[PDB]
Design a protein around this ligand. Structure first.
Ligand SMILES: CCCCCCCCCCCC(=O)SCCNC(=O)CCNC(=O)[C@H](O)C(C)(C)COP(=O)(O)OP(=O)(O)OC[C@H]1O[C@@H](n2cnc3c(N)ncnc32)[C@H](O)[C@@H]1OP(=O)(O)O
Ligand SMILES: CCCCCCCCCCCC(=O)SCCNC(=O)CCNC(=O)[C@H](O)C(C)(C)COP(=O)(O)OP(=O)(O)OC[C@H]1O[C@@H](n2cnc3c(N)ncnc32)[C@H](O)[C@@H]1OP(=O)(O)O
Ligand SMILES: Cc1cc2nc3c(=O)[nH]c(=O)nc-3n(C[C@H](O)[C@H](O)[C@H](O)COP(=O)(O)OP(=O)(O)OC[C@H]3O[C@@H](n4cnc5c(N)ncnc54)[C@H](O)[C@@H]3O)c2cc1C
Ligand SMILES: Cc1cc2nc3c(=O)[nH]c(=O)nc-3n(C[C@H](O)[C@H](O)[C@H](O)COP(=O)(O)OP(=O)(O)OC[C@H]3O[C@@H](n4cnc5c(N)ncnc54)[C@H](O)[C@@H]3O)c2cc1C
Lengths: 607, 607
């Protein structure tokens, strides 16, 4: 029970702020209503706090062991027991398509449900991502492939996304894994892939579906020459799903990692052990990188939600500790050797820290749920009034913030959680150091922060012609211009909005100048990450401010008890974030407006 | 070679070309030690650190100490004990140790530069080796008879511990309840349980350990003032020949399991609970505990700061070497060309932003601790700064919480950039950076948490000091500012200096106003840590700019080759730090100028 849930804040966001309950009980969600939604969140939170979290420590202390001659991995018993708990409740099939055995629901609710597993034992969700991949394989497959996808979903097969090679990580287009077409239309995949998550998973599933990018012989270079292939660990009867002969795809190494140790991160050899790795061309078309980006988009959303979930149970652990730990006297009596001892929540610096953890943890939760409300065209219409096209664009703009800004912030602020515990924070007895170790990875896989920032500017803003960016900007400006108890917050948000507008203009300016002087484009790269983070802060402050507005109406209406405390905290957090986080964006804008290429022209030897 | 990558070149630059410590070398107290000898010593211990000391860095983490309950002792891994012997055999126990205890006299600026290499290669190795330096502290505070014991302890190389912390008394040292009961023969029996004691046992590295234990004499008043300091040896011993006799009643009962620094045995220490008394001797036969122990704390705080700085330095140099070799992607000026030549990642603007950020903070921090060390000898302070002993002492005290607090916090933050430079591989144990992070997380906690450093900085080192040491340092910064290739830096430093003056004035205002409104003092707590960090950023900016000024002179004088490259990087680092770090202080001042106690008045339950 390391994991501390927060269903209350999830429901507040989903219903009182974004109004996702408006589509519940109607249309696609005809058979699921607001009170069923609340019960599902509560149920998976209890399961996460119990069976799923019970093996959080065990997985880290007792990580998988690799047998190099069987090419398999043994997982610790307690963690497998948690996996079965997850399956027995059917939680690998929330938001899964109905025709695959799923329960239809808005994606905002689905990701909120997944938050609890990511918070209690993130690697358990990664192992359990098979069905969701089967759906993507289904959506992209031939009719015949759709039958396989249905089988995989029903049978609970695991799955992997196979891109990375030793010399091709960020530069996916440099991968050299080959695909050799056979007369009967199958392909033989030949190469070595690296860092593949869940490439083997002990006896959790009867099969693993590997989705492998490979370059067909003679195809062009870059990502555009790449194709995607369904490569099952086991051959299987394509009508009954019956498991057959082993396919030539074998794990040949398992990495030793700083954290997330219970997730087998594997070197994967295809067609190197005298057995062909048979693959099937997904959709029987050559459109590899486009197809895998359906999966990359899911992976990036999960990583951000993972980091945010971890920060939130990090904060709540730090809060509970701070509440019971007595140390020192109140600052108004610090000169009195005999003054009463106080719990450390009385100390200004501990309070500064807890509110920093709170505001960012809750600000990020708002961000990922906000992002999710544009993932269904029909939730996007009901709660935002935007059509499918703008919704998709707005969702694509927000993903790199969820991933890039969520991974970086979660890890940073976990430093505060650990600090709240003093020296005991450095002990394994408490979960925060594992939170830190487990979450460090989130700035790296599924595309690094710099890649996130490069995606954000060039594709999600410039290639987008700024349409999504402008929609969100307009919603921020609308809130600013609408009581007076939020007068100061709106002023601080107006400054920050303008600050981000300034950054966007400078970086655009640097791009335009690259028409005349190629090197000018380096200035965009230099400021890309600071800009991504600046947008994340602006969204946090805006969404917190929205939450404070709802909290004041509900407080004004007579809220009492625990409700009253919750709403009071939202008001405090929005005000604290506006007054302590948002002003730094002013300086950041001024730094971006003055970037120069000195650091680019400097001789490498001078570093 | 090793994980540990040294930087003797940058150390000698600071000691000689910037601060002119060589100007006291070869004469008087240091007459047996000239510039050439000092450098050869630095080169020598750098090689020891890169070889035998660093060799057991990984083993200490992977094969950590074990507590034996049958023996109440601790077992160390063989490889790490081999490193310890390498250190002892070289006589590196006694650099800066007083000559009458067998040490080599040297300026403290040189002493800590030598120690940086050990803290970089295997920091626990120095902690286990701090026995002799503790014997010197015991000597200076002890009676004549005790001076004889301390001489035996130094000569025979006994280990040592500082024993303050208890389960209910960490930062609040004065709340400790371990008691001392005076015996007829003038000795004392220490009775209590202490927590988190570094090196409380050390296997068979030494023949005895000197525990320096804070305890309250029966009947003494409360708080730190009621405490006394006691010499409590692991073994009784002949007070004149040093022959080791019967076991004393002070036993390790457990060894903690930690995020990092694993090879450092951190133990619960029981005094007089296993059936034999822990006999102790009142240090100096006076009741003056907390002042006496602070001789040790001041050393411990300097070591922790230098340790964090050492770790960032080798973290940065590891990331740089990696970035030089890793090919990934095309140059940004060719980003749309999928046939463009691949480049090494030092060509990517964000990688360069990240490397220059690591560089500037690493080298800026080395400058800070070496600058701080130039005020730890009266002779060096007068010769290189022209300040008397009293002022020097005050300026050194002012700078320690910056070395410790700002160094601790920055090192850990920027190691994130080091790990990020390796991409996914940074998450692997195959590379040392993830261990650097786990090993350095502790630096913000022991020897006083960052909040305690910030509280000490403002209340004792500025306010109680009447701003004299602070006014001296501000005067040197303003002198540099007033003196053209460094005009922009001096402009930005002027802004930064005023920004810190403002923060100081706001905070002083909040404190003085507590006379008429007690709650006003909470605003000091709310802003103290940010204020400490701003001074650290100001000092780094100043010192790097000073380094650039010497680098300009040296290139003007004709420097070539590797020298030229070094001086060029100092210019780039100084300008980059002034343009990308210092401006943020303006927003931080404005934030400190509008702190309020909303966060203090909020109900705990609203968190
Ligand atoms: C489900 C069960 C298994 C999963 C469970 C475990 C999950 C654990 C999560 C961690 C696992 C991983 O890390 S998987 C590997 C992740 N790898 C990456 O994210 C790749 C990072 N690098 C990049 O993104 C690069 O910027 C690059 C896109 C690869 C650069 O290549 P490039 O050729 O230069 O791209 P570009 O020219 O911009 O466009 C090419 C082509 O790609 C499509 N596309 C690009 N960007 C997209 C985004 N943001 N979204 C959707 N699609 C994108 C797109 O088709 C484009 O073509 P065009 O439309 O431009 O013609
Ligand atoms: C050494 C070889 C052994 C090898 C292993 C060691 C290396 C491992 C590294 C980690 C070791 C540790 O972590 S040991 C534990 C360290 N503990 C702390 O640092 C305590 C942190 N908490 C504080 O500092 C508190 O603020 C406090 C000072 C203890 C608060 O007590 P309080 O009574 O309220 O303070 P105050 O009234 O202001 O002063 C009382 C008295 O204390 C002296 N003193 C305080 N601050 C001093 C500083 N900065 N410098 C010197 N002396 C200080 C001082 O004598 C003062 O008396 P007055 O002068 O005010 O009358
Ligand atoms: C635990 C773990 C699990 C993983 N699981 C999977 C998996 O299941 N499937 C899979 O396909 N992959 C997986 N990966 C691979 C992961 O996605 C890659 O590590 C990641 O995309 C970064 O690639 P890289 O390690 O080669 O780093 P690199 O690409 O070599 O990056 C090195 C550095 O250069 C920078 N850089 C590189 N190119 C650019 C550029 N163009 N512009 C600016 N900066 C740049 C990066 O930001 C980084 O700082 C996993 C990785 C880890 C650590
Ligand atoms: C690896 C390790 C080795 C150690 N080795 C030694 C050793 O050799 N000798 C020894 O004596 N000790 C040692 N310690 C103890 C260490 O010095 C203490 O843990 C440290 O001083 C923090 O105290 P604490 O753990 O009780 O935290 P607490 O005092 O309980 O503090 C917890 C939190 O409250 C905050 N806080 C507390 N009081 C105040 C206040 N007045 N104002 C504002 N904020 C406040 C802190 O900043 C922190 O965030 C070691 C600790 C560790 C982790």
């Amino acid at each position: 029970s390391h994991y501390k849930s927060n269903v209350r804040d999830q429901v507040f966001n989903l219903f009182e702020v974004f109004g996702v309950d408006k589509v519940l009980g109607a249309d696609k969600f005809s058979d699921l209503d607001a009170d069923t939604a609340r019960e599902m969140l509560t149920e998976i939170a209890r399961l996460a706090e119990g069976p799923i979290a019970e093996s959080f420590v065990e997985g880290d202390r007792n990580p998988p062991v690799f047998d190099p001659e069987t090419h398999t991995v043994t997982l610790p018993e307690g963690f497998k027991k948690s996996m079965r708990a997850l399956f027995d409740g059917g939680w690998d099939k929330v938001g899964l398509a109905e025709h695959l055995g799923g329960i239809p629901m808005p994606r905002a609710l689905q990701w909120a449900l997944i938050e609890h597993i990511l918070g209690a034992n993130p690697a358990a969700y990664m192992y359990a991502m098979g069905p969701g991949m089967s759906e993507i394989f289904y959506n992209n497959g031939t009719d015949e492939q759709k039958k396989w996808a249905t089988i995989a979903a029903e049978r609970g097969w695991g799955a992997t996304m196979v891109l990375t090679e030793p010399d091709a990580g960020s530069d996916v287009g440099a991968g050299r894994t080959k695909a050799v077409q056979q007369p009967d239309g199958t392909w033989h995949i030949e190469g070595v892939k690296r860092f593949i998550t869940s490439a083997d998973s002990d006896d959790l599933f009867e099969n693993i579906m590997h989705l492998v990018l490979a370059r067909p012989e003679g195809a062009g270079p870059g990502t555009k020459g790449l194709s995607l292939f369904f490569v099952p660990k086991f051959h299987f009867d394509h009508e009954t799903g019956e498991i057959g002969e082993r396919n030539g795809v074998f794990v040949t190494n398992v990495e030793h990692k700083m954290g997330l140790k219970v997730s087998a991160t594997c070197e994967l050899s295809l067609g190197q052990h005298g057995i062909p790795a048979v693959g099937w061309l997904v959709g029987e078309v050559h459109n590899g990188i486009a197809q895998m980006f359906d999966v990359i988009e899911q992976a990036r959303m999960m990583v951000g939600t993972k980091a945010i979930a971890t920060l939130s149970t990090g904060y709540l652990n730090a809060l509970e500790y701070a509440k019971e730990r007595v140390q020192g006297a109140d600052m108004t009596q610090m000169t009195d050797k005999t003054a009463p001892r106080v719990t450390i929540t009385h100390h200004p610096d501990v309070r500064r820290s807890l509110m920093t953890q709170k505001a960012y943890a809750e600000g990020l939760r708002a961000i990922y749920l906000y992002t999710a409300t544009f993932q269904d065209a029909e939730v996007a219409q009901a709660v935002h009034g935007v059509d499918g096209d703008l919704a998709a664009r707005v969702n694509d703009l927000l993903l790199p913030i969820v991933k890039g800004f969520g991974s970086e912030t979660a890890y940073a602020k976990l430093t505060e959680s650990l600090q709240t515990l003093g020296g005991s924070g450095f002990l394994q007895d408490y979960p925060i150091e594992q939170y830190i170790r487990d979450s460090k990875i989130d700035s790296l896989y599924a595309g690094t922060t710099a890649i996130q920032a490069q995606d954000f500017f060039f594709r999600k803003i410039i290639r987008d012609k700024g349409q999504a960016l402008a929609y969100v900007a307009g919603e921020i400006e609308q809130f600013i211009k609408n009581n007076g108890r939020l007068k100061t917050e709106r002023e601080l948000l107006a400054t920050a909005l303008a600050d981000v507008q300034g950054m966007a203009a400078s970086l655009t300016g640097y791009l335009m100048a690259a028409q005349e002087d190629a090197a000018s484009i380096y200035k965009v790269g230099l400021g890309s990450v600071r800009f991504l983070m600046a947008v994340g802060d602006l969204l946090s402050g805006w969404l917190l401010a929205r939450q404070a507005a709802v909290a004041i109406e509900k407080l004004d209406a007579g809220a009492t008890g625990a409700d009253k405390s919750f709403y009071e905290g939202k008001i405090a957090a929005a005000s604290f974030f506006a007054k302590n986080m948002l002003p730094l964006l002013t300086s950041t804008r001024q730094i971006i407006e003055n970037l120069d290429n000195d650091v680019m022209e400097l001789d490498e030897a001078a570093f």
